[PDB]
Amino acid sequence: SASSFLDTFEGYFDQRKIVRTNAKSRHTMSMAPDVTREEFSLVSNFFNENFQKRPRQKLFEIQKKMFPQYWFELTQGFSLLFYGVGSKRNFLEEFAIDYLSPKIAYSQLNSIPCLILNGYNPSCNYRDVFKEITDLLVPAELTRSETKYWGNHVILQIQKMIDFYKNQPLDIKLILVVHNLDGPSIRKNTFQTMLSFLSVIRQIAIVASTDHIYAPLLWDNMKAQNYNFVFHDISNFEPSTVESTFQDVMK
Amino acid sequence: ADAQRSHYTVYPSLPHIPFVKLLSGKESEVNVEKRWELYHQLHSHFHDQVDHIIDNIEADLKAEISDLLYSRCFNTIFLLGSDSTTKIELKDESSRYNVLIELTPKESPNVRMMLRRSMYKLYSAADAEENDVSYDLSLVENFKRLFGKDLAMVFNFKDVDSINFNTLDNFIILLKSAFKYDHVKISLIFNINTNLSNIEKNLRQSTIRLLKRNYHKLDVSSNKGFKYGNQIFQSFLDTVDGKLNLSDRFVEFILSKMANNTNHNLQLLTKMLDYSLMSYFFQNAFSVFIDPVNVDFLNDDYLKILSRCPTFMFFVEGLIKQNRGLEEFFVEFLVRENPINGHAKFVARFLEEELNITNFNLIELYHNLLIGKLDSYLDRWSACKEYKDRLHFEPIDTIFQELFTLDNRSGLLTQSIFPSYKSNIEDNLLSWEQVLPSLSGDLDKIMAPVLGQLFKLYREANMTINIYDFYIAFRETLPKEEILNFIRKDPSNTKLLELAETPDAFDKVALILFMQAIFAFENMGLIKFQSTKSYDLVEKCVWRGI
Amino acid sequence: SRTIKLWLKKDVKNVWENLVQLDFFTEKSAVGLRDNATAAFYASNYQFQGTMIPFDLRSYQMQIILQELRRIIPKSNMYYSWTQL
DNA sequence: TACAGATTTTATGTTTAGATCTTTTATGCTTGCTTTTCAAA
DNA sequence: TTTGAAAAGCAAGCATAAAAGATCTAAACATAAAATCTGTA
């Protein structure tokens, strides 16, 4: 850019200048090479499994030494929100399955069940997620007085769960691994209300990930208070092979 | 596959505390255990007091609401700064039935649903205390015939600053028609979070004139007069009194963070206090010496670490200007009271009870006592002029008091609870060698990760970017011969060798690596495609440091 | 300049609401009363953009134009000269 | 076997969440023209 | 101290994105009479 500033509001105002019509290039993808789906996939997995794999493995071995600190934060009622550059899918599965569930199961004497939401899926739906939560936790059904007048039964059920679990012993019964809390269907307000109200309950551990740069805009004071986040930057430059297949790539 | 499902439950097969071994792994496990147990005594002694304080908050809020509520118009109460989480309970007084009707903006899409939900609640409560009805206002008309008792309705409008004010205005005008029925009295409670003047201009002037006939204001924010946060801070002072001390940086950070939160800064205050206690009992190997029973377990590592104390440094430098003995000195010199907390409590109870100075925050009082400016804090009231010599205090800079301190210098509190999220993402993108270690060895040193190179070319480009020109600019930095040597280093994969044999291999590899990074940037929110069916230009959405 | 009390903007709000209620101004592009109960029920479940903005920015249109106002306001009225442009 | 009671089937009403399509209005690019401050004489 | 000239700003025109909302449907929520199952007497 023919600019004097790059960073801050100075760079924002200096790089948004009115470029003339004659200065604009007319280049398109018609002068770009054509690639097929299969060679794209082939070069993709070869670069994902060989370009800087050894520094990524060293860095992943570095971040694994923070797992007891994550467990200690989860025992005090904080929800983990992991952010960074690159995919955090394998990190969240490995921490929540290989480490967190056996440590929690041994610390309170089967392992603790881990429910994994995939928010990179657009078809992640809060009613079916609450159906499996009901299956795992077996809460008491709402009475007729509690149903109100065409009220949302999921939210009223969770409020019943909140003032039931306030008296229970503080033993973690469910681990909730939310991949991509900022994904296209999970970022909507009803799903976020559902998950923050589930984050109120001490007996559920919440491990979440975000990918968008504007993700803290999802949470107001009520939602940030209910979520009770401790933030952790675990940037690894992971390629995100799983999440990339839910968008149309070659277009 | 589980990676392609919306959700799935895992019951993983399995074949004892989260504290680790400090002192470079030469700490004993029993000291780890009593570190854990001491952390739990401090955490429990803090949170029992916090729970009692919170129950007191809701108790006095209920008392003040009931006093303002029961001591031909509405009885209007404006709860200013209310999160609408207060459980209002009405009295049980004979010959009259009192109903609380709670209404939310989600429950209020129009006036008809407002009236139908309110009348269903009215009939449900009146049937639950002691034939179907129509859920409209005539049930209010026929309430004395159907139930034999007078009626007192209290409407609690939850989160008024989210409701449609046209609907609320029409509902209040509709409720005005019940004034002529001689057995009905109506109270309205508005939970306002912005200001009264905002809800004044969103309502009709006749509705304002109706509400003005009998109204009261009740201000209950999270720190109305600082009285409830002072109790939480004082309970934290008492749970670490004679045991830990607060730096002025930590109290300054606490005041700065409570200034940035309006409605929920009590729980935020508790959150940073507990995270600081967690960080100390996870970090410091000397926390076992919080208990004076464990002082006989000293080692050479403990004495080696405690020798690097700046206050002990200045003490021994003054001694030379003017191990067993060091052990006895360390045992003897950690006994004393550190009376800053007792003096802070004395100043607080002197200002609150005697002078009737009630609009003070204990946290800035403690900050000024920490930096030695309690007179410079006290002289803002012009009422304790005669007692400036009375309440004078100077701190005693005791030695190795930073081995037992809560202090904010590493930015661990900033990184964990209030991170610079977008700036951390941009910093990791732009400067990826602070992320990835500097250890296919030839390619990993000569060519950057593709996301970082894409962000470097992204930052120095205009607001509108042609992606063909952007891809050529990305292509000119990559090394051709090293890429072609790296792609041929897998002889088991023959399609890779076949594609590397083509003369247009590097352009295809560059386009593949460019398109993956472009879709990563679009998913992260950095770039925005202009049109749906063009995909030829992008706009930058994100600038670093702003 | 050629003495009428100049009423403040906080007092003209009541006059403005009275003028709206007396069917002198209509909200811009408002449908009004629907033809049937089904369209009225559909309209009752939607929040219109006029009812979510502050009242001083709501767009209105006249039911009576300035030429009609000049036609029916008497010559002796002291605001008569401003019905002309 | 008969039968009172509980559940299912069939059938419809109530309310909220969201999709689609149209119409009118903001807005972004094009192109030509006028003003203005900044890197050399 | 000037210069002048290339960047910045104005403005008409026009294609196009988008706001607003009319119209509608799916889905959650809700009720109910007749039929059918179900455990006993």
Swiss-Prot record, chain A:
Source domain of life: Eukaryota
UniProt keyword terms in alphabetical order: DNA replication, Nucleus, Phosphoprotein
Record carries keyword Ubl conjugation: no
GO cellular component: chromosome, telomeric region; DNA replication preinitiation complex; nuclear origin of replication recognition complex; nuclear pre-replicative complex; nucleoplasm; nucleus
Compartments it resides in: Nucleus
Cysteine-cysteine disulfides: none
Keyword Nucleus: yes
GO MF term list: chromatin binding; DNA replication origin binding
A biological process term (GO) from this entry: pre-replicative complex assembly involved in nuclear cell cycle DNA replication
Family classification: Belongs to the ORC2 family.
Its job: Component of the origin recognition complex (ORC) that binds origins of replication. It has a role in both chromosomal replication and mating type transcriptional silencing. Binds to the ARS consensus sequence (ACS) of origins of replication.
Miscellaneous information on this protein: Present with 1700 molecules/cell in log phase SD medium.
Subunit organization: Component of the origin recognition complex (ORC) composed of at least ORC1, ORC2, ORC3, ORC4, ORC5 and ORC6. Interacts with MCM10 and TAH11.
Protein name per its UniProtKB record: Origin recognition complex subunit 2
Organism the protein comes from: Saccharomyces cerevisiae (strain ATCC 204508 / S288c)
From Swiss-Prot, chain B:
CDD domains: Orc3
Gene: ORC3
InterPro entries from the UniProt entry: EF_Hand_1_Ca_BS, ORC3, ORC3_N, ORC_WH_C
Protein name: Origin recognition complex subunit 3
GO molecular function: chromatin binding; DNA replication origin binding
Function: Component of the origin recognition complex (ORC) that binds origins of replication. It has a role in both chromosomal replication and mating type transcriptional silencing. Binds to the ARS consensus sequence (ACS) of origins of replication.
Assembly and interaction partners: Component of the origin recognition complex (ORC) composed of at least ORC1, ORC2, ORC3, ORC4, ORC5 and ORC6. Interacts with ORC6.
Pfam families with a match to the protein in the record: ORC3_N, ORC_WH_C
Assigned keywords, A-Z: Acetylation, DNA replication, DNA-binding, Nucleus
Entry similarity comment: Belongs to the ORC3 family.
UniProtKB/Swiss-Prot annotation, chain C:
Signal sequence range: none
Disulfide bonds listed in the record: none
Subcellular location(s) of the protein: Nucleus
Family of the protein in this entry: Belongs to the ORC4 family.
Summary of subunit composition and partner proteins: Component of the origin recognition complex (ORC) composed of at least ORC1, ORC2, ORC3, ORC4, ORC5 and ORC6.
Function in brief: Component of the origin recognition complex (ORC) that binds origins of replication. It has a role in both chromosomal replication and mating type transcriptional silencing. Binds to the ARS consensus sequence (ACS) of origins of replication.
Additional facts recorded: Present with 2170 molecules/cell in log phase SD medium.
Name of the featured protein: Origin recognition complex subunit 4
Gene that this polypeptide is encoded by: ORC4
Residues of the full protein shown: 424 to 529 of 529
